[PDB]
């Protein structure tokens, strides 16, 4: 099924700073497909509102430069739901964090997927963490997902992890 799970007790004020998409998944080839993919984001840092919202700092290759952006996630009556807004209100979820180390979450949409789910794994030094890849995996045995990219140090530590 879909996102079946999320972190009790989300101290947002705890995944301030800097973040390294070190994986990322999705339900479709296409979402993490080329480079240009939509969902191909690497984040760069979260910054939490004192409101208690969710600024993303991401970098996205669009036309074709790694271009940085920077989106808003606003707060839910749900601690650890935020949501992000489109002509398709989609959502981010955070599986799970241990808030020194890795942040799993995954951002979805609202209409079905296949159609639609996208997850990472970030950590919070440009290292390979097996263990927070494990809990990924784990956590995401449960979910339709279809493709899976895995970074390296060296790549970690450039822009669009090149
Ligand atoms: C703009 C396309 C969606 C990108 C959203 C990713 C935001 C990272 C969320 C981190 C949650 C702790
Ligand atoms: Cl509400």
């Known amino acids: 099924l879909?996102?079946?799970q999320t972190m009790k007790g989300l101290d947002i004020q705890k995944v301030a700073g800097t973040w390294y998409s070190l994986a990322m998944a999705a339900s479709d080839i296409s979402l993490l497909d080329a480079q240009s993919a939509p969902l191909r984001v690497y984040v760069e840092e979260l910054?939490?509102?004192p409101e208690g919202d969710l600024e993303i700092l991401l970098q996205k290759w669009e036309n074709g430069e790694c271009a940085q952006k920077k989106?808003?996630?606003?707060?839910?009556k749900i601690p650890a739901v935020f949501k992000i807004d489109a002509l398709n209100e989609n959502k981010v979820?955070?599986?799970?964090?241990?808030?020194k180390k890795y942040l799993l979450f995954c951002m979805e949409?609202?209409?079905?997927p296949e159609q639609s789910l996208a997850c990472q794994c970030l950590?919070?030094?440009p290292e390979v963490d097996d263990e927070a890849l494990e809990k990924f995996d784990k956590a995401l045995k449960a979910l339709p997902m279809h493709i899976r990219l895995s970074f390296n140090p060296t790549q970690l530590e450039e822009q669009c992890h090149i």
């Open 123 to 125: 950590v919070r030094t």
């Open 109 to 112: 949409n609202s209409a079905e």
């Open 47 to 49: 910054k939490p509102t």
């Open 71 to 76: 989106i808003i996630a606003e707060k839910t």
């Open 93 to 99: 979820l955070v599986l799970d964090t241990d808030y």
């Open 2 to 4: 879909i996102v079946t």
